[PDB]
Amino acid sequence: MKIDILDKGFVELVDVMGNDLSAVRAARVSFDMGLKDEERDRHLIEYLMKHGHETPFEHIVFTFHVKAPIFVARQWFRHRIASYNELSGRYSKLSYEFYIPSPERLEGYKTTIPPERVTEKISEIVDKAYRTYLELIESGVPREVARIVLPLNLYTRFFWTVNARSLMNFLNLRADSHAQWEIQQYALAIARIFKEKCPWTFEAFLKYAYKGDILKEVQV
Amino acid sequence: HHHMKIDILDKGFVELVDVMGNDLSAVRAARVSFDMGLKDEERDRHLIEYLMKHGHETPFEHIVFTFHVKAPIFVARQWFRHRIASYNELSGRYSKLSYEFYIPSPERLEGYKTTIPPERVTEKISEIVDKAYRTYLELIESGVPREVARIVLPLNLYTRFFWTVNARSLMNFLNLRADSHAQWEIQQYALAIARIFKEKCPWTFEAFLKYAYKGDIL
Amino acid sequence: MKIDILDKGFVELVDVMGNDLSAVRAARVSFKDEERDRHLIEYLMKHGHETPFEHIVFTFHVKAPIFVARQWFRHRIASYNELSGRYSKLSYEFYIPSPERLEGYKTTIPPERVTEKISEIVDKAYRTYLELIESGVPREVARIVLPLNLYTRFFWTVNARSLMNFLNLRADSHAQWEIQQYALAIARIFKEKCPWTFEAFLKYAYKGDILKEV
Amino acid sequence: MKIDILDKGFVELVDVMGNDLSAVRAARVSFKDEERDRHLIEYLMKHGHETPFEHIVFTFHVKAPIFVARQWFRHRIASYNELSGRYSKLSYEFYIPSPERLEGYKTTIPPERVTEKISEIVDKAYRTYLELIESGVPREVARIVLPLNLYTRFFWTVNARSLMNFLNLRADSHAQWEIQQYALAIARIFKEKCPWTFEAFLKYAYKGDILKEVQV
Numbered sequence A: 001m002k003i004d005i006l007d008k009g010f011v012e013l014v015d016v017m018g019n020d021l022s023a024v025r026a027a028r029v030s031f032d033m034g035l036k037d038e039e040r041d042r043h044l045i046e047y048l049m050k051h052g053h054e055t056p057f058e059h060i061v062f063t064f065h066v067k068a069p070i071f072v073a074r075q076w077f078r079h080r081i082a083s084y085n086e087l088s089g090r091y092s093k094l095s096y097e098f099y100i101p102s103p104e105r106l107e108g109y110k111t112t113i114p115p116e117r118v119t120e121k122i123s124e125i126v127d128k129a130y131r132t133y134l135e136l137i138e139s140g141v142p143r144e145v146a147r148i149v150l151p152l153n154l155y156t157r158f159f160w161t162v163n164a165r166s167l168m169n170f171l172n173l174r175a176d177s178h179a180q181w182e183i184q185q186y187a188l189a190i191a192r193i194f195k196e197k198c199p200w201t202f203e204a205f206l207k208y209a210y211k212g213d214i215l216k217e218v219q220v
Numbered sequence B: 001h002h003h004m005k006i007d008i009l010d011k012g013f014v015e016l017v018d019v020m021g022n023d024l025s026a027v028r029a030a031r032v033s034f035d036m037g038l039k040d041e042e043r044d045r046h047l048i049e050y051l052m053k054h055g056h057e058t059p060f061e062h063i064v065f066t067f068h069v070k071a072p073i074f075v076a077r078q079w080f081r082h083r084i085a086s087y088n089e090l091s092g093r094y095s096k097l098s099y100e101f102y103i104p105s106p107e108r109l110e111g112y113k114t115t116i117p118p119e120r121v122t123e124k125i126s127e128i129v130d131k132a133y134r135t136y137l138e139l140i141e142s143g144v145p146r147e148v149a150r151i152v153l154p155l156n157l158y159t160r161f162f163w164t165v166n167a168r169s170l171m172n173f174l175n176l177r178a179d180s181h182a183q184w185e186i187q188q189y190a191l192a193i194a195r196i197f198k199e200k201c202p203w204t205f206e207a208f209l210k211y212a213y214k215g216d217i218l
Numbered sequence C: 001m002k003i004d005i006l007d008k009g010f011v012e013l014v015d016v017m018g019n020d021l022s023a024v025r026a027a028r029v030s031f032k033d034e035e036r037d038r039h040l041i042e043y044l045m046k047h048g049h050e051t052p053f054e055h056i057v058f059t060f061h062v063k064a065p066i067f068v069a070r071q072w073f074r075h076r077i078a079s080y081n082e083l084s085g086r087y088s089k090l091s092y093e094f095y096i097p098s099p100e101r102l103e104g105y106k107t108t109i110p111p112e113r114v115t116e117k118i119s120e121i122v123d124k125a126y127r128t129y130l131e132l133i134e135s136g137v138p139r140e141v142a143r144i145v146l147p148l149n150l151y152t153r154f155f156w157t158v159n160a161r162s163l164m165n166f167l168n169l170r171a172d173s174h175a176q177w178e179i180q181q182y183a184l185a186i187a188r189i190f191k192e193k194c195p196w197t198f199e200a201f202l203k204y205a206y207k208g209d210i211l212k213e214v
Numbered sequence D: 001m002k003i004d005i006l007d008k009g010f011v012e013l014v015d016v017m018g019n020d021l022s023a024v025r026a027a028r029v030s031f032k033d034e035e036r037d038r039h040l041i042e043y044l045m046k047h048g049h050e051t052p053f054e055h056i057v058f059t060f061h062v063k064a065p066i067f068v069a070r071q072w073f074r075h076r077i078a079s080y081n082e083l084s085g086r087y088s089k090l091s092y093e094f095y096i097p098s099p100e101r102l103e104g105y106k107t108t109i110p111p112e113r114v115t116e117k118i119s120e121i122v123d124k125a126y127r128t129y130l131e132l133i134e135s136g137v138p139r140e141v142a143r144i145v146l147p148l149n150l151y152t153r154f155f156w157t158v159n160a161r162s163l164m165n166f167l168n169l170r171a172d173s174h175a176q177w178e179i180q181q182y183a184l185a186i187a188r189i190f191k192e193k194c195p196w197t198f199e200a201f202l203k204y205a206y207k208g209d210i211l212k213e214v215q216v
């Protein structure tokens, strides 16, 4: 499962541990019980969600491989209850890959210049900065220092391991109109994968705990 | 990474319920920083020892385990102090607890010259435990709320819980519990955890024991 | 500031860093007068912006029964240091519920009688403990016969945001009555040190019930 | 206490709870005696008993380039609040390495030339940013053309234990030079408020190299 986001980004599911039944089992232990039947365990997940019993969902875990603009990764990395490993700018020569907003991105705003022109000015800086970047490196300048001229729309990559509860906290904040449109798109891809792996939890989440808005109108 | 079970103490156990990833999971995560991926067994295994040597612990957070543990409360209280993990435990306020208590064996006193025979100690612990539990059943039978009746049950009462923890946090756990300074009872559980860890992540475990393990019993 | 809880417990403030203004200042980095500042706090509280409150921290000294502490310690976003039963000799102090504790419940055994059976078990258990210790049994082993109502003490450092999460879960009728009592005390001290943040909490974020009543 | 770092940054102490005795009170779980207390602090540090130190907490106000903040924010056991490029118009403040930053490296061009090149692109990027803003382009979007050396500001609340882990990782020759500088400033303030913990830290637990060199 690899979903393309923006012009060169993506969200890819690397691994997963457990499913909806992992949470049912975890929660049953409190009552010294185990699993029962579909409509029973399905009903439990709904009960847990509607009453704020979040811990059982911590037993479901995902590992994603994500490609995204640094300005997006900076917001993303603010989520502390998860694990990260990202491409290093001091240890690797960075690739010429930047997020160039589509002209449609400015749709809904009165601008003095045409969207196409905006798109042009951004690319201009990008090409100029990257050119400066390579020149510095070829001149013997350390990579960790040369990359400081690169803009925030530069694409980075990282692995993200997070449990289902933290993932839902993530969705409440990023799968929402108040978050920047760009990370909203990534949150959609995360939600789609989460739905595929934990349908019962996802549904119960949208129905009883989700606090954002976009997931109620969009599909998957 | 599907199933294993080890019995601890007289009625306890550590059972592996699930696992996500393996040694290569850490290799992949670490390589991303250099914009690379997996290489060969030789180079990849070399990286794991390299990470361990210089204390690059983040890559190992991508390896996750879920255990199902049965242990006495005094052990659980020590265990639960490890904050970077997830738990769900049997509830004394919601369910009727069973007559299961950890009774130390006479050998648990080996090295300690006691006034009364060790067997005597074992017997006296069983006695108090039996009395407390009978009082518990009596209060429950008489309508006393479960959450109140259980307060008379002793610390060696067995409890059960699910524990999800990543490899990095697991190694932190072993540095502290797989050590002669930790209480013997929890050392036993730590040894079982180490056995399952070793089985699921040979390279990581081996590198851990050789370059990072701080304890003295593994 | 100290508050007695149950029959022999307590919660006392040891230290605190910051106040309502600490949250205002931290949130002001993203982008005054009492009016504008307090309005900001209600604004942050209203919209779920919890991070600014993490810059206010408390340290409590708590005395409570182990069964209460076991629930309390499940709150991971905080720091703890508790008395050790394997290193020090344990004191003869247990929580004996008052007869009023079983109020509302129709029990075959009179509430006063229930209270007595608990004290009885506690007494016998503690004697066995001392008996074992004097026989040469190490403390870490002898203490396993002691009941869950044994009192313990610990230091608790927690930020305002985490404290509010604690109040949502423990200052509620669903939580066991015993810990509800401690949560009330915790809330009282929080109110004293952070009135604006506290008022805004009850008004827009607090999910429990008892703080709206008591 | 405010220490300047790099060319336009700084580390400033906003608040602090407790001192060395706070870890002592916590470890004993009670409530003085310098000899005893200091000995205990050393004992704890020597045998890996770090929890008592979580009871000492600092709040800093930091100004640093984004590439530095991105490394800094990787420290999860702490609290942050940072200036937002989505809601605020950003100021023309960037970190321009001095020619001295590249002394010790064989470059095919004079260090001053690297300074000029970095500053030129920075200047062009900012001008575009301003033109985009004036044009009505949203801030959250207009700022994506701004380079990684843009200065940001944030409040950082962290306990002494977590602060020591930060020092271990950042106050070390392996960490990028720029964050090393911030780590030194953090250490000085820490040493100022908790002299006993700091000395015990360097003596028994500190894993980095630089702090045993440059004093305070």
Ligand SMILES: O=c1[nH]c(=O)n([C@H]2C[C@H](O)[C@@H](COP(=O)(O)O)O2)cc1F
Binding pocket: A071, A074, A075, A076, A078, A178, A179, A180, D082, D083, D084, D085, D086, D087
């Ligand atoms: O929607 C937002 N999400 C987010 O995570 N930040 C955090 C990320 C970073 O630490 C700092 C600056 O963010 P930005 O420039 O994107 O506004 O605040 C800010 C926002 F406005």
Ligand SMILES: O=c1[nH]c(=O)n([C@H]2C[C@H](O)[C@@H](COP(=O)(O)O)O2)cc1F
Binding pocket: A086, A087, A088, A089, A090, A091, D067, D070, D071, D072, D074, D174, D175, D176
């Ligand atoms: O010394 C380093 N410190 C650090 O915190 N990172 C993290 C920060 C970020 O999440 C990603 C890219 O860092 P950078 O481009 O500065 O190398 O890895 C990388 C290093 F090499």
Ligand SMILES: O=c1[nH]c(=O)n([C@H]2C[C@H](O)[C@@H](COP(=O)(O)O)O2)cc1F
Binding pocket: B074, B077, B078, B079, B081, B181, B182, B183, C082, C083, C084, C085, C086, C087
């Ligand atoms: O080896 C130990 N491990 C541990 O986790 N504690 C913590 C657990 C509990 O929260 C409190 C009292 O522990 P105990 O009575 O087992 O000594 O301190 C204490 C020890 F001595």
Ligand SMILES: O=c1[nH]c(=O)n([C@H]2C[C@H](O)[C@@H](COP(=O)(O)O)O2)cc1F
Binding pocket: B089, B090, B091, B092, B093, B094, C067, C070, C071, C072, C074, C174, C175, C176
């Ligand atoms: O209201 C509760 N609060 C709580 O923190 N637990 C946790 C504490 C402990 O880890 C385990 C057993 O709790 P208890 O026996 O008090 O029900 O579950 C359980 C409850 F029912």
